[PDB]
Design a protein around this nucleic acid. Structure first.
Ligand code: CL
Ligand code: CL
Ligand code: CL
Ligand code: CL
Ligand code: K
Ligand code: MG
Ligand code: MG
Ligand code: MG
Ligand code: MG
Ligand code: MG
Ligand code: MG
Ligand code: MG
Ligand code: MG
Ligand code: MG
Ligand code: MG
Ligand code: MG
Ligand code: MG
Ligand code: MG
Ligand code: MG
Ligand code: MG
Ligand code: MG
Ligand code: NA
Ligand code: NA
Ligand code: NA
Ligand code: NA
Ligand code: NA
Ligand code: NA
Ligand code: NA
Ligand code: NA
Ligand code: SR
Ligand code: SR
Ligand code: SR
Ligand code: SR
Ligand code: SR
Ligand code: SR
Ligand code: SR
Ligand code: SR
Ligand code: SR
Ligand code: SR
Ligand code: SR
Ligand code: SR
Ligand code: SR
Ligand code: SR
Ligand code: SR
Ligand code: SR
Lengths: 56, 92, 194, 237
RNA sequence: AAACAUCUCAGUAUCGGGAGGAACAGAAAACGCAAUGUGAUGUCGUUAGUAACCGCGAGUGAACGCGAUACAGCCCAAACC
RNA sequence: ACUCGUACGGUCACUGAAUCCUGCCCAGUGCAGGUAUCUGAACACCUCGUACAAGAGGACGAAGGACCUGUCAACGGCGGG
RNA sequence: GCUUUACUGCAGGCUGUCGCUGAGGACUCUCACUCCGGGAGGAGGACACCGAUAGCCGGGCA
């Protein structure tokens, strides 16, 4: 069984969903953690300086 | 090679020829308080210590004479260039 | 004449001698059984607390904090490092234990601000410090001429920014002349070389 | 290289844990106040998933229903005793002090009241040899002379299930089923059969440990493989 | 650094914590143009690529002072009550 | 974690059902044990040095090594004349 | 990426020493501290654990 097309058919699991806090479809319904805003992980909002060029 | 323990030659101090005694220069002990000694302790820590992680080099097949020439009358010594000698034994 | 305080002071110059020695031997047994931060009714070293600003008043709190003794609890490099940045055992942190203690105390009492702290001993595996904290919201303090300054907005979370006596000393701000070229006015403004 | 299998173990991930949620009970001796006024009746004999040996369910006078590490020869209806004055009969538990020298015991406590630590496997038994006011000498299954506090409790008799080891597994499938009842990763791939990156013995055209197998006690994890601090090897000499 | 380990890149990127409208510093156990002299602290210009560091290699690199900006000095602990 | 486990256990390795068997080698390397003597760091101690300190030397000496022994179903070896 | 008796280091283990740490070159004790016990109490004990440092080993890792 190939890793390509044939294995794409088994994908019918729901993981990332609309997030209650930020509105993005990044709330992982299995981990109960938003990969976009950190909801479920931290009270503070997920943020990182590498999300932009260093001197900006 | 052989060499006379004492012989007449020029004494740069008396400024005239006089009897001298030849002696192989004996190494003097270190005090461990020279600047280099303190730099080894200041700069050596965790990991490699640069120049202080290097170890003693090799040896030349033959070394040069390392002698002192002491004036028999004023007691002062002077140094001279040395020459490669596999062995140096004094006579008397 | 000598104050009664001078006697507590003089006792603590040699915590390992006299009655104080026996007291510590007894006390630590109980301290080892207490938590990381225990609020206490009265300072153990009265002379020191009063000297640092303590007052027997509403809004003044004292707490004893214990911290594990020793160097840094550092994790070894998982990625490439030149010999120089591979050390793990002899590396120590840049904040002293007294400062780590002041911060834990202040976290326990989120509404209070650290005024100062002092040492109350240690055993072979931990150190204890007592920390004086002030309630900037209590009127008994807002009306005190010696402590109301700590009620200002810019004094909020002062301990976390190094504004403590222990904070300032650890930052190398003691000397006003030689040796403080890279500590004053701040470690950061000097490129972090102090 | 990469961490070896022995190192993956310590992390205690599912692959290496024992099926605890399936285990029955902790067969520790009952805790008696004193006097031995504790007796129960064997209400049933059960299989113990964690030891491949049988265990007995006992109902005690005071109303406690607990599984017990059963010796050989215990059956339903039989009455068991646990205390200093318990009768010297197979299946009863009492401190070594009260036990007559020369009597096989099992589930021997290491420290009085711990519940039992030694001689708990199928068909094994410790052998109480010497008594005293300060030290009871027991000979454990490995044949070692152990000095114990005479206050250490034990059960008279040998453990049930003896001889379980006499019959060969015959099939890999049988080994399999038993392994699924333990905290062990099975089957076993030889170190020599792996790539150099995976084990000290991996690599090389043909298979062979490119090094002596007797490793020092001081060796770090990841390197301590093969024959650990062997005092000797082979069958000769 | 024409490799590279001290050094460099650099206390930079990035990470944890925290305050403000600005922060931090700050009224000498200072300075040491050594003096019959200066007089809290930032910052700007300069001192200066100087002193100092350094496989004394490549490189790293201040301060006092001076000219400016703005200026401001106070409160406890204890003694005695 | 192993482990509601305790030597009929479980960890670490090698060989790879049964059957008939599995010789010689402990010098080197590995492991392990022992060790009169030798060697063997720091702190403390002693001598010199310094009104102190740096430092030089000494006495003591742990593991380790030297040295002895055990061990090949331990790495491996079993040639030329 | 991999190897090793390549160079240089780093974890880790063993070992000594100092602190924890007490009383009367071998010793006793209990009071810190450790372990067992539901508890009383028992076992151990200034050792061990832990912090610091020193020597040895150290492709396990860079
Ligand atoms: Cl010569
Ligand atoms: Cl605070
Ligand atoms: Cl098995
Ligand atoms: Cl001046
Ligand atoms: K580099
Ligand atoms: Mg007043
Ligand atoms: Mg049990
Ligand atoms: Mg399984
Ligand atoms: Mg296999
Ligand atoms: Mg392969
Ligand atoms: Mg490998
Ligand atoms: Mg093979
Ligand atoms: Mg380069
Ligand atoms: Mg600033
Ligand atoms: Mg060069
Ligand atoms: Mg720099
Ligand atoms: Mg200056
Ligand atoms: Mg095979
Ligand atoms: Mg095969
Ligand atoms: Mg416990
Ligand atoms: Mg490598
Ligand atoms: Na230095
Ligand atoms: Na706080
Ligand atoms: Na280059
Ligand atoms: Na290169
Ligand atoms: Na350098
Ligand atoms: Na001038
Ligand atoms: Na051999
Ligand atoms: Na590659
Ligand atoms: Sr397949
Ligand atoms: Sr297909
Ligand atoms: Sr699916
Ligand atoms: Sr969470
Ligand atoms: Sr962020
Ligand atoms: Sr240094
Ligand atoms: Sr070093
Ligand atoms: Sr040569
Ligand atoms: Sr806050
Ligand atoms: Sr148990
Ligand atoms: Sr228990
Ligand atoms: Sr191999
Ligand atoms: Sr043999
Ligand atoms: Sr002014
Ligand atoms: Sr066979
Ligand atoms: Sr050998």
């Amino acid at each position: 069984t190939g890793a390509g097309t044939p294995s794409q058919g088994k994908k019918n699991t729901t993981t990332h969903t609309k997030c209650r806090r930020c509105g993005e479809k990044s709330y992982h319904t299995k981990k109960k953690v938003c990969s976009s805003c950190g909801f479920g992980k931290s009270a503070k909002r997920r943020d990182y300086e590498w999300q932009s060029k260093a001197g900006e | 090679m052989q060499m006379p323990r004492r012989f007449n030659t020029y004494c740069p101090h008396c400024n005239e020829h006089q009897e001298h005694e030849v002696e192989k220069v004996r190494s003097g002990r270190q005090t461990g308080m020279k600047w280099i000694d303190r730099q080894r302790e200041r700069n050596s820590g965790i990991g490699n210590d640069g120049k202080f992680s290097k170890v003693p080099g090799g040896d030349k097949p033959t070394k040069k004479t390392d002698l002192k020439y002491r004036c028999g009358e004023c007691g002062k010594a002077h140094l001279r260039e040395g020459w490669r000698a596999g062995r140096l034994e004094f006579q008397e | 004449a000598r104050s009664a305080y001078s006697y507590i002071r003089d006792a603590w110059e040699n915590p390992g001698d006299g009655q104080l020695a026996e007291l510590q031997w007894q006390r630590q047994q109980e301290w080892r059984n207490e938590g990381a931060v225990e609020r206490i009714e009265r300072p153990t070293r009265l002379d020191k607390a009063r000297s640092q600003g303590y007052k027997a008043k509403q809004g003044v709190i004292v707490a004893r904090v214990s911290v594990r003794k020793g160097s840094a609890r550092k994790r070894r490099h998982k990625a490439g490092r030149r010999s120089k940045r591979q050390g793990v055992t002899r590396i120590t942190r840049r904040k002293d234990i007294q400062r780590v203690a002041e911060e834990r105390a202040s976290r326990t009492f989120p509404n209070l601000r650290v005024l100062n702290s002092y040492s109350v001993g240690q055993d072979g595996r931990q150190k204890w410090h007592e920390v004086i904290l002030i309630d900037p919201n209590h009127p008994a303090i807002q009306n005190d001429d010696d402590l109301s300054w700590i009620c200002a907005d810019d004094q909020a979370d002062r301990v976390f920014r190094g504004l403590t006596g222990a904070g300032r000393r650890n930052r190398g701000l003691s000397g006003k002349g030689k040796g403080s070229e890279k500590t004053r006015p701040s470690l950061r403004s000097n490129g972090g070389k102090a | 290289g990469r961490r070896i299998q022995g190192q993956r173990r310590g992390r205690g991930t599912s692959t290496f844990r024992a099926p605890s949620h399936r285990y029955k009970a902790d067969l520790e001796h009952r805790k008696v106040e004193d006097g031995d006024v504790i007796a129960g009746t064997v209400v049933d004999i059960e299989h113990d998933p964690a030891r491949s040996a049988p265990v007995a369910a006992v109902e005690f006078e005071d109303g406690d229903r607990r599984l017990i590490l059963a010796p050989e020869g215990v059956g339903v209806g039989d009455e068991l005793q646990v205390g200093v004055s318990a009768e010297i009969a197979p299946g009863n538990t009492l401190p070594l002090a009260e036990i007559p020298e020369g009597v096989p015991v099992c589930n021997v406590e290491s420290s009085p009241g711990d519940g039992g630590k030694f001689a708990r496997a199928s068909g094994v038994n410790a052998q109480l040899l010497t008594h005293d006011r300060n030290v009871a000498v027991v000979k454990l299954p490995s044949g070692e002379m152990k000095r114990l506090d005479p206050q250490c409790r034990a059960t008279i008799g040998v453990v049930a299930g003896g001889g379980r080891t006499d019959k060969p597994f015959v099939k890999a499938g049988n080994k399999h089923h038993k392994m699924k009842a333990r905290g062990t990763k099975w089957p076993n791939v030889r170190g020599v059969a792996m790539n150099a990156v995976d084990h000290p013995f991996g690599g090389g055209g043909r298979q062979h440990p490119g090094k002596p197998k007797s490793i020092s006690r001081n060796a770090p994890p990841g390197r301590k493989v093969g024959d650990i601090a062997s005092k000797r090897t082979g069958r000769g000499g």
